[PDB]
Amino acid sequence: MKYNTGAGTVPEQLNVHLVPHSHDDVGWLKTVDQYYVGSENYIQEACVENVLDSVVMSLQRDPNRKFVFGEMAFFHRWWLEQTPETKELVRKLVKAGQLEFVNGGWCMHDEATTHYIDMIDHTTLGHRFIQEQFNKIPRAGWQIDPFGHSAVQGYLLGAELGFDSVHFARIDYQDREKRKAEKSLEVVWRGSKTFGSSAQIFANAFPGHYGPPNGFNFEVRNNFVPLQDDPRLFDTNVEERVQNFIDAALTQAKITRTNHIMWTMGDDFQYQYAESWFKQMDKLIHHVNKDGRVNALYSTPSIYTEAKNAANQTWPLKIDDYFPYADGRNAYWTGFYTSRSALKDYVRMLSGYYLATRQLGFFAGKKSTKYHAFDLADALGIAQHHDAVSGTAKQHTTNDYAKRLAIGASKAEAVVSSSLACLTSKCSAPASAFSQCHLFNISYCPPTESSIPDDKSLVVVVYNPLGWSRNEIVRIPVNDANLVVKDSSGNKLEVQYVEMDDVTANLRSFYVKAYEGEVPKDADVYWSLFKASVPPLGWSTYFISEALNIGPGDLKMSFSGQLKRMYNSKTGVDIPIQQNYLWYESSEGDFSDYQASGAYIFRPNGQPPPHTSSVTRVTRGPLVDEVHQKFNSWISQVTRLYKDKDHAEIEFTIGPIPTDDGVGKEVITRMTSTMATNKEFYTDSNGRDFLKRVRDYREDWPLEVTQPVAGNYYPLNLGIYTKDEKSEFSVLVDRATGGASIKDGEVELMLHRRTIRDDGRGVGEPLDEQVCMTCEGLTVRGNYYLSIHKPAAGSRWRRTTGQEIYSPMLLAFTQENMENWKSSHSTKGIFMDPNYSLPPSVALITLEELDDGLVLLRLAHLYEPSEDAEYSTLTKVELKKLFATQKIEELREVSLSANQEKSEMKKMKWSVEGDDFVVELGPMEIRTFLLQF
Amino acid sequence: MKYNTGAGTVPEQLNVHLVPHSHDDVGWLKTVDQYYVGSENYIQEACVENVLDSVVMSLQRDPNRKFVFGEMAFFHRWWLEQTPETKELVRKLVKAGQLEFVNGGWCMHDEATTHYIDMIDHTTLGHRFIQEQFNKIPRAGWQIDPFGHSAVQGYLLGAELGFDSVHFARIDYQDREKRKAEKSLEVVWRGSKTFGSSAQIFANAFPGHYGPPNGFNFEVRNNFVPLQDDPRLFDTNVEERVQNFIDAALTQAKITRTNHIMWTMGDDFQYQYAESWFKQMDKLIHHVNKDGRVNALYSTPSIYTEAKNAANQTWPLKIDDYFPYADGRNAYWTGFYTSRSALKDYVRMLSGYYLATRQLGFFAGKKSTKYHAFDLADALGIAQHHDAVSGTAKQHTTNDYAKRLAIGASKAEAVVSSSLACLTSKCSAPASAFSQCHLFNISYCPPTESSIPDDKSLVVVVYNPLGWSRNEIVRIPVNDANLVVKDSSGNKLEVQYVEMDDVTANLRSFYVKAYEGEVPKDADVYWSLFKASVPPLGWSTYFISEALNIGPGDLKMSFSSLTGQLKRMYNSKTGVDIPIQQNYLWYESSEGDFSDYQASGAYIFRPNSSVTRVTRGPLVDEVHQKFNSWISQVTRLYKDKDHAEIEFTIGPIPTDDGVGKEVITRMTSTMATNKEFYTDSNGRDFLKRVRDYREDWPLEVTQPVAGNYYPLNLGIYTKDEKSEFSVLVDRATGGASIKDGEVELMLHRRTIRDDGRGVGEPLDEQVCMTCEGLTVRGNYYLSIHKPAAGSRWRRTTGQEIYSPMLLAFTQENMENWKSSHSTKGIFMDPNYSLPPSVALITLEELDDGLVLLRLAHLYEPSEDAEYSTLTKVELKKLFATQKIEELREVSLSANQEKSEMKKMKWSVEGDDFVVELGPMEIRTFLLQF
Ligand SMILES: *[C@@H]1O[C@H](CO)[C@@H](O[C@@H]2O[C@H](CO)[C@@H](O[C@@H]3O[C@H](CO[C@H]4O[C@H](CO[C@H]5O[C@H](CO)[C@@H](O)[C@H](O)[C@@H]5O[C@H]5O[C@H](CO)[C@@H](O)[C@H](O)[C@@H]5O)[C@@H](O)[C@H](O[C@H]5O[C@H](CO)[C@@H](O)[C@H](O)[C@@H]5O[C@H]5O[C@H](CO)[C@@H](O)[C@H](O)[C@@H]5O)[C@@H]4O)[C@@H](O)[C@H](O[C@H]4O[C@H](CO)[C@@H](O)[C@H](O)[C@@H]4O[C@H]4O[C@H](CO)[C@@H](O)[C@H](O)[C@@H]4O[C@H]4O[C@H](CO)[C@@H](O)[C@H](O[C@H]5O[C@H](CO)[C@@H](O)[C@H](O)[C@@H]5O)[C@@H]4O)[C@@H]3O)[C@H](O)[C@H]2NC(C)=O)[C@H](O)[C@H]1NC(C)=O
Ligand SMILES: COCc1cn(CCCCCCCCCN2C[C@H](O)[C@@H](O)[C@H](O)[C@H]2CO)nn1
Ligand SMILES: [Zn+2]
Ligand SMILES: [Zn+2]
């Protein structure tokens, strides 16, 4: 029999857009490769190779069939295995529109715990591949699973990518009720207060889930009702199945605007045998359309959006974001804003490093390795997956993520070493030319710990990957107490010695062995500190050889023994402020609700958070004032006021979190003032826009308060701040972190979490992270940064220090005779014009060599219009001065993901309820260029 | 990457022939159509449409891949839904050898409870489709699942089909141990005593199961280890999987002759997503052969057989059969020999009716409808499946089988009625011309129960589908006591009235309602009996209108009187005389003990009186016997019958005491049978069985009852130096001789537990409206003869039991009838019979002008001095009203020129139009008129 599968939309009937898809997690209960090859099916039945294999076969069978695929991490692995014949069939299918890429990034990223730089990076990775192989530009965003949604997702990873639409299943459960009643599930979304309608997108919140209506899942071996239309066989059931379809369509139509609705015909890792689904959809399209009451068609999210746009309809407006997300009364998904802190820091650290790595490789002439096996691009793009950096994957999967990141970090570390060796001489240098250290956090750095032979000096090369000149404190572990630091010009520099502490030494012994496999030499005796000064996008070289109020600067802090006050003499801000460590007790269920706190969901006990305190050292010196604090045996902190820093730097060391008492614990630091913050506080969106949050309040619906704490937590990637008439109090993070203001004048950060129960959303594991050789709970160490400012003065600290945290100096070490080194190496350099700096409001967020001679460049304006009277303004960058030592032959502006010419981008129109080489940049703008040299 | 999937065999290595297959039950836990379309997956995950869809896609991707498929019941349902492009693609795959048909019948039939005529019929239905669509002749028999194997499967449904091999997984568990030790899993099997090596076949019994070695089932969503050979991905495992493969190959090689072994790469309803299997098999062939220690290839059972035949090797010999089957000490699969007796009788009755239907349609010029939806050919073909007539499907599946058979029977009924209307007239006649009755067993025949109008008669047309003239008793239910029966010439015939009985009357009210939905009219008051005389392949017409020792003939029986119940049988003309008792007993079903939990069930048999009337008359003497409230019997000696007909009525089997019961009739004599007894092979050859003994291995006796039951489709007999005692059945039935001079039949079974082989249902058959246990009624036939004179009774009466007269009824004034209708007729020559040794088992109109004809010699060489000899049939006299234009002798399934059939050679350890037939021969022909 021939089925009429080629139906399009029809004007005066309800149209049911059948969109076949397979939701393929880039790691979750299995690793990425396990999901691809289909191993470990006892954990979860899932094989993405079967999906792509069988979908291509089913699409070949009938030209009217369609399927949408998203995650290029899987597609690219599959593609490299396919024959030339298959690759050509795929080209035909993509060219015909039968297989359409939706989203098209390397993964479907989390939107809470991700940084916009990483979101752009992996999306570009996917889009370049799709553009190269198929000459296709994705037009529909696909965020069907991420646990809430960010403003930047809407305007920057949606509209600015060229997406007309973005589709997602998860919104807050109270909000969803209101949107159904108001038919506002689909909105025109303006995530940017700066760009408004110039960066808007059609946003489609599904009625419930991203699966088919009940009885319309057709996966092989499932117990569905096949449409039996053969009169030679018993029990035909055509009329019943057609009515099943209509009934489901009418229910959805009752909550949707226009005569067009969409069915997401798929689910988690479905389509292992695609024909099982397409057989049923073939028959349903055929028989439903013969019936004639409604109209069914094979479609895609972009065909659907096109029909939604051509309709005569005005649409409700959506501003800001969809955080936080709850799927039930006691189930706010705000715990994963913090879950797996160590993995979050690892991602953030490697992202900064990878940024610098691509800079140095470009100058030294290195060749792109983006699509090579186990490259850091693959590893960091996988890491953005919505179960990966978010913390919501199984532990073995999480270990596999970190294994892949470490492999890519090792490749990047060799690129940096070889590149700096070439660029500092007076490119083929060996990677052994310099040594580098990434375990300063636990004091392990063999290059600076080892002894210096006579007539030689420890050479320290300092590379600065910001487009600003920078002054910073180098702090290295040493075993000699009479070293001299000389700058490039022979002058001895002022130094300070800081004594090794017992917390750090105790971390060193355990974790060096865990990470590196062998037990290290004795704990270093001292830290050596000195202030380095480095040109923008350049290096300085130093030579090292043998011969209660604190605050070396304007910012002062007062302690008992605990913090009591912060003030700035020069600016005249002064608040009494206390900081303490506490923890919420993790709920394990109660009489009214079995929901437990777990890796996704933060549900505190409803008991007040238990209190922890004594000073163990107060240190004073020209470069740093320090207060070492121990709150208990597993919570210790160091507060540091460094020379020339407009902030304190608070180093936390948390763990092992004790659960032998059977009580899960979610550890916070809480900063309590008297500022009249009036329930307001500000948190960033993926590290960019600041969103005004209001305690216990929602703009889009009248919140029913059910979790007065968990319901006020928001995801941080840059930081959190508060203000009143007289002060502005700001906190910056070093990794994705959850933050809230639970009381006026009060800010808190959740820093580490260890539960005894799983939260029943499918991961099947309490968040119980341990380190072994003889195991104990994982300890995390990191920094948060705090400062005080007059109103309208804090934004420039937040932006400037945020970028500095993102992009620290890179240190490279070797031992050579100083004079011999100065004879064969330039001790100072800059790749920009010697007297050029990027404006203070701009960051060079992408600089990378692509295939052939093409260079990808991105410049970001860091400020929103109303933040800083001087810097929230129009500025310019002279690219001739940015590349002083090279001549631009070609310049070309492209879309954010570099898959379209900027000038060719077109926008849909919506009726919304309530309505030379010099590059200019307005507030919040990001401009992307392809260059040739 | 490209994989070297084109490997062939290599001489200096062990070769693993990978044979992809999907074992598709034609009904079992789900019905055949549910299995096809994949509905009711909560019962069992199984969809045959997916198998054929995805296998054809997978074969298309790589020309070196192969797959074997067997069950045309499924293939044909799928074929008619396919597009022209798919059909064209399938023809290319079949022509290239990528898709090979094995077996090729409509189903994979049981070999215990099936009759050879039904086996030939459904195999022909499948093979004719295969030949017409693809010009292919299957060469491998595929019997991987049936529970034991019959001698007729080997020589007749194997060798004579043109099969070089037959493959099966199930043999007795004790036999299997010996055959592993002696490397005699594979044999040259000679199932026929008569034909020996002229009808031999390579018989391959698998080491254990028909699935793959452990860890090589690759069905989508199963937890197997994929072969990961991409160095860009973590956890490559090529070495591990290659070694897994080798270890399994070497283990099998140690119990197999030659350097070729076969892996059956599949299982029940597998290959829903075929690419999941072929991907792994692609990579295993590639990397195993790169390694080079063993050799792997895509293969088929026929390619494997060729390799085994080409080896320089001598093979052990197998004779007789593989019954009974047991897979454990207390697990003899001999219960299903009797399970679902009523379904078995239903199949047997419809097979004979379908034989007559195709004769009558041919004579009347009816067009063939063999491949039409719900045709009786489909229903009867399906019913041969190894869970169907065997009785081992779920109850709802069994109901569906009976519904398809009833649909087919209703169509056959109209053909018979329309054909007889045309042929007796002086085809376009309507089905309403005659009525017919199939419920005589419960006394329900409205056409004869109904009053006759004055100046009209009940016209009775009697058709005889045997090639022998036949006299037999017509016995119809009537409501008037003074009816007169005249033959066609006007002669009044001797009649006998027999009173209705209470047992039948209560069956009638309950079962007529069950079968037809409404209670019947008043029970009929009498049976009218009379003797009809009918030409072979012809008819006689009769007109009915208003006007303790027994034995009306030579055979006599003596009953105690004090207790009822047989005591003695003797024939006064031949001098045979044996004391003999007949009793009803039951075994208690085991529900397992603490040492073995095995219970009795649908597959496995695991065991733990007054005369109410004596009737005498010129046409029948009978003794009604009531053994208890749910067991009654009537023993009948009919005029001119050389045997007693013993009608049992059993049920409802009481089950409330908590114990299951398996009911037998046991005939006990003093004959010196010396542990020997004789049972038939699919209604054909008799095999000598010996109590508690096995020819091929030293039996360890664990079930001295259950291990001595054998499947009967014709009957069972014993003998000593003075007598032969013979028992014929009317349906597939289990029988045994548990002591010397003693013979027993299992007639009905009801268990309270399942026997744990997958059907998940106690054998607990019930009739519901209120429910009660099912009641079965049927006949077995007893007789006594002098040695070497019993065989001719068994063969002749067996064919008469198989092919009874067909009665057609109407009411008309006699003279107006005789004026418009030929009262008497035959389609053969007016004075020609087939020889007494011959039966016309097939006569059928195919498409175009082709007619299919089969003649069978009923006798084995040693059986009857007169009839066990070469004979001949005159085809011009068989077809008297037509002229034979063309004759062509073909193979048994009619897919080959008989003259062009080729046989492999094996070295075996220990070594006009007149049709001639030697003993046990079946010759098949295509004729054109
Ligand atoms: C501070 O700061 C810092 C920063 O800096 C932070 O962070 C950190 O960091 C660090 C660095 O620094 C890091 O570390 C790193 O890490 C990574 C990861 O780790 C993880 O993972 C792993 C893995 O896992 C997996 O596996 C296992 C086994 O099986 C298991 O168990 C698990 O579960 C998983 O599993 C999964 O997956 C898989 C796949 O993958 C599958 O198969 C399965 O089935 C599943 O599914 C692990 O292992 C680990 O663990 C460890 O550790 C821990 C801790 O962490 C502990 O606790 C434990 O216990 C352990 O430990 C133990 O052990 C060890 C070993 O044995 C020893 O040693 C010790 O001692 C103890 O006892 C974890 O979990 C990793 O990966 C890395 O590693 C690496 O590296 C090192 C040096 O560096 C060494 O030592 C090692 O060995 C390694 O090495 C390697 O790699 C490299 C790169 O990466 C290279 O270069 C080299 O060469 C090597 O390699 C090569 O070779 C080899 C031989 O040996 C091989 O294997 C390879 O291969 C591969 O790949 C390829 C390509 O190429 C392919 O083909 C194949 O397939 C393979 O695979 C190559 O070839 C390190 O360690 C960490 O992680 C971090 N952390 C976090 C948390 O994240 C921190 O945090 C801070 N701190 C504070 C603040 O406090
Ligand atoms: C509660 O205690 C434990 C327990 C378990 N079980 C049942 C185990 C059943 C195994 C079935 C395996 C698969 C094949 C079953 N075949 C499939 C063939 O295609 C079909 O034709 C055969 O009829 C049929 C039977 O052999 N019982 N009790
Ligand atoms: Zn997901
Ligand atoms: Zn079977």
Q: Return the CATH number at B793.
A: 2.70.98.30
CA B650 – CA B512 distance, rounded (Å)? 17
Are the C-beta atoms of B748 and B778 separated by less than 8 Å?
no
What's the CA dihedral at A642, A644, A646, A649 to 10 degrees?
Answer: -20
> By the 8 A CB rule, do B41 and A224 touch?
yes
Length of chain A: 933
Alpha-carbon distance of A752 to A780, in angstroms, equals: 7
The dihedral through the CA atoms of A119, A122, A125, A128 has a sign that is negative
Closest by CA position to A111, among listed A171, A177, A199, A193:
A171
Report in angstroms the alpha-carbon separations of B586 from B589, B706, B741, B762.
Answer: 9, 13, 19, 17
Q: Which two tokens stand for residue B505?
A: 């009357």
Inter-chain contact B233–A36, Cβ cutoff 8 Å? yes
Which residue minimizes the CA distance to atom 48 of ligand 1?
A: A399
| Residue A655, domain member (yes or no) | yes
Report how far residue A47's alpha carbon sits from residue A783's, in angstroms, rounded to the nearest whole number. Answer: 40
Residue where a domain terminates, one of B333, B354, B388: B333
Given its phi and psi angles, is residue A822 left (phi above 0), alpha (psi -120 to 50 degrees) or beta?
alpha
Distance, in Å, from the CA atom of B70 to the CA atom of B51, rounded to the nearest integer, reads: 12
User: Closest by alpha carbon to B747, among B820, B673, B661, B840?
Assistant: B661
Residues A115 and A234 in one domain: yes
Residue A280: both structure tokens together: 């049923």
Same domain (yes/no): A312, A185: yes
Structure tokens at A710: 């968990």
Residues 6 or more apart whose Cβ sits within 8 Å of residue B586: B653, B661, B662, B663, B664
Residues 6+ apart with CB under 8 A from A731: A671, A719, A720, A721, A739, A747, A749, A784, A785, A786
Last residue of a domain, one of A284, A307, A337: A337
Coil, strand or helix at B311: coil
The residue whose C-alpha atom lies closest to atom 58 belonging to ligand 1 is A772
* Six-digit token string for B316: 């052990």
Q: Among A337, A355, A376, give the residue marking a domain's end.
A: A337
SS3 A56: helix
Nearest by CB to residue B272, choosing from A37, A220, A234, is A220
CA distance B452 to B440: 19
Residue corresponding to tokens 């047997």: B348
A650: enclosing H helix or E strand = strand A648-654
Q: Which residues in chain B have Cβ-Cβ distances shorter than 8 Å to A41? A: 221-224
Report the C-alpha gap between A71 and B503 in whole angstroms. 75
Query: Resolution to 1 decimal, in Å?
Result: 2.0
Give, for B244, the enclosing helix (H) or strand (E).
helix B238-253
Q: Phi and psi for A540 in degrees, rounded to 5?
A: -125, 160
Question: Quick one: DSSP state of residue A599?
Answer: S
Look at the block and give the residue holding tokens 């299918």. Answer: A93
Q: Are A91 and A191 members of one domain?
A: yes
Is there a single domain that holds both residue A662 and residue A753? yes
Question: Backbone phi, then psi, for B220, in 5-degree steps?
Answer: -55, 140
Q: Please tell me what DSSP assigns to residue A661.
A: T
Q: CA-based angle B132:B138:B142, to the nearest 5?
A: 130
Pairwise CA distance, residues B208 & B170, whole Å: 8
- Tell me the helix, strand and coil percentages in chain A, rounded to 5: 25, 30, 45
Tell me, yes or no, whether B734 and B848 share the same domain. no
| Structural domain boundaries, residue A573 | 550-806
Q: Which atom of ligand 1 is nearest to the CA of A782?
A: 137
Nearest to B781 by CA among B738, B732, B725: B725
Query: How far is it, in rounded angstroms, from Cα B540 to Cα B532?
Result: 8
Calculate the alpha carbon distances from A659 to A755, A861, B540, B771 in Å: 8, 46, 98, 62
Nearest to A81 among B1, B220, B276 (CB): B1
Name the helix (H) or strand (E) containing B432: none
Which residues have C-beta within 8 Å of that of residue B751, sequence separation ≥ 6?
A: B589, B599, B600, B601, B602, B660, B662, B762, B763, B764
**What are the strands of the beta sheet with A555-559, ordered from one edge?**
A549-550, A555-559, A563-568, A573-576
Closest atom, ligand 2, to C-alpha of B392: 23
> How many CB atoms are located within 10 Å of the residue B647 CB?
18
> How many beta carbons lie within 10 A of that of residue A783, not counting itself?
18
Nearest to A220 among B34, B50, B228 (CB): B50
Distance CA B818, CA B796 (A): 33
When CB atoms are compared, the residue of B33, B80, B275 closest to A234 is: B33
Q: Is B86 helix (H, G, I), strand (E, B) or coil?
A: helix
Best CA proximity match to A356, nearest among A463, A265, A281, A432: A463
Asked whether residue A120 falls in the same domain as residue A169, the answer is yes
- The C-alpha of B47 sits at a distance from chain A's nearest C-alpha, in angstroms, of 8
Q: Which two tokens stand for residue B42?
A: 């909560």
Kindly state whether residue B908 falls inside one of the protein's structural domains: yes
Same-domain status, A125 and A272: yes
Q: How far is A103 from chain B (nearest CA, A)?
A: 24
Rg (CA), chain B: 29
Strands of A266-382, DSSP E: 295-298, 314-315, 317-319, 326-328, 331-332
Q: Mutate which of A26, A51, A232, A396 to test chain B, going by most B C-beta atoms within 10 A?
A: A232
Report which DSSP code applies to B666: E
**Considering the domain boundaries, does residue B517 fall inside one?**
no
Dump strand ranges (E) for A655-741. 665-672, 680-684, 690-694, 714-716, 719-723, 728-733, 737-740
- Please choose, from the candidates A614, A612, A651, the residue with its C-alpha nearest in 3D space to the C-alpha of residue A784: A651
In a domain, A686, yes or no: yes
3-state secondary structure of B499: strand
Whether B605 contacts B514, CB under 8 Å: no
Say whether B629 sits in a helix, a strand or coil. coil
B570 with B690, same domain: the answer is yes
Tokens representing A252 are: 């959805």
Q: How far is the C-alpha of A272 from the C-alpha of B808, rounded, in Å?
A: 58
The answer as to whether A691 is a domain residue is yes
Atom of ligand 2 nearest to the CA of B147: 26
Whether A394 lines ligand 1, by a CB cut-off of 6 Å, is no
Closest CA to B46 of B32, B33, B31, B35: B35
CA of B397 to the centre of ligand 2 (A): 16
Q: Total domain count for chain B? A: 3
* Same domain as A860, residue A729: no
Q: Is residue B556 part of a domain?
A: yes
How far is residue A136 from each of residues A101, A125, A130, measured CA to CA in Å?
8, 14, 6
* Chain centre distance of CA A525: 37
Nearest CA to ligand 1 atom 30: A396
Per-residue three-class SS string for A167-231: EECCCCHHHHHHHHHHCCCEEEEECCCCCHHHHCEEEEECCCCCCCCCCCCCCCCCCCCCCCCCC
Centroid of chain to Cα B107: 12
Distance CA A796, CA A790 (A): 11
* Structure-token match 């309208």, residue found: A792
Question: How far is residue A837 from each of residues A269, A470, A535, A549, A810, measured CA to CA in Å?
Answer: 50, 11, 9, 37, 19
Using a CB-CB cut-off of 8 Å, the residues of chain B touching A81 are: 1, 230
B532 close to B807: Cβ distance less than 8 angstroms: no
Does residue A134 contact residue A95 with C-beta atoms inside 8 Å? yes
B569 found inside a domain: yes
In short, whether B757's Cβ falls inside 6 Å of ligand 2 is: yes
Q: How far apart are CA A565 and CA A579, in angstroms?
A: 10
CB B756 near ligand 2, within 6 Å: yes
Q: How far apart are CA B245 and CA B543, in angstroms?
A: 76
Residues of A in contact with B400 (CB under 8 A): 234
Q: Which of B85, B230, B400 to mutate to test the interface with A (most CBs of A within 10 A)?
A: B230
Distance (Å, rounded) from C-alpha A153 to C-alpha A146?
Answer: 11
Kindly report whether the peptide bond that precedes residue A20 is cis, defined as omega within 30 degrees of 0.
Answer: no
Across the interface, do A222 and B57 touch by the CB < 8 Å criterion?
no
In sequence order, what E strands does A34-164 have?
67-69, 99-101, 140-142
Contact yes or no for B37 and A272 at CB 8 A? no
Q: Which helix (H) or strand (E) holds B798?
A: helix B790-802
Of the candidates A336, A329, A337, which has an alpha carbon nearest to the alpha carbon of residue A173?
A329
Question: Which residues on neighbouring strands pair with residue A565, listed in sequence order?
Answer: A558, A576
Residue A369 burial (C-beta neighbours within 10 Å; 0-12, 13-18, 19+): middle
Is A220 in Cβ contact with B221 (below 8 Å)?
yes
Alpha-carbon radius of gyration of chain A: 29
Q: Does a structural domain hold residue A267?
A: yes
Q: CB–CB of B276 and A83 under 8 A?
A: no
CA-CA distance, B76 to B791, in Å (whole number)? 41
- Indicate whether B762 and B880 sit together in one domain: no
Decide if B145 is catalytic: yes
Same domain, B24 and B165: yes
Q: What are phi and psi of B379, to 5 degrees?
A: -65, -45
Q: How many CB atoms lie within 10 A of CB A383?
A: 30
CA dihedral (A796, A802, A803, A807) in degrees, to 10, reads 150
CB neighbour list of residue B811: distance below 8 Å, 6 or more residues apart: B450, B452, B453, B456, B457, B458, B459
Q: How was this structure determined?
A: X-ray
Return the active site residues of A.
145
- Of the residues B25, B118, B145, B378, which is catalytic? B145
Strand partners, A75: none
Tokens linked to A889: 């032959």
Closest CA to A25 of A394, A370, A399, A278: A394
Distance of CA B884 to the CA centre of its chain: 32
Read off the CATH number of the domain in which B31 is found: 3.20.110.10
DSSP state of A330: T
Q: Which two tokens stand for residue A525?
A: 């005796």
Angstrom distances, CA of residue A763 to CA of A22, A187, A396, B798:
19, 32, 11, 69
CATH of the domain at B867: 2.60.40.1360
> What gap in Å lies between CA A307 and CA B62, rounded to an integer?
41
> How far is CA B253 from each of CA B142, B262, B314, rounded to the nearest angstrom?
22, 10, 17
Q: Are A473 and A642 in contact (CB under 8 A)?
A: yes
Task: Classify B662 as helix, strand or coil.
Answer: strand
> B797 and B843, same structural domain?
no
Side chain identity at residue B792, one-letter code:
R
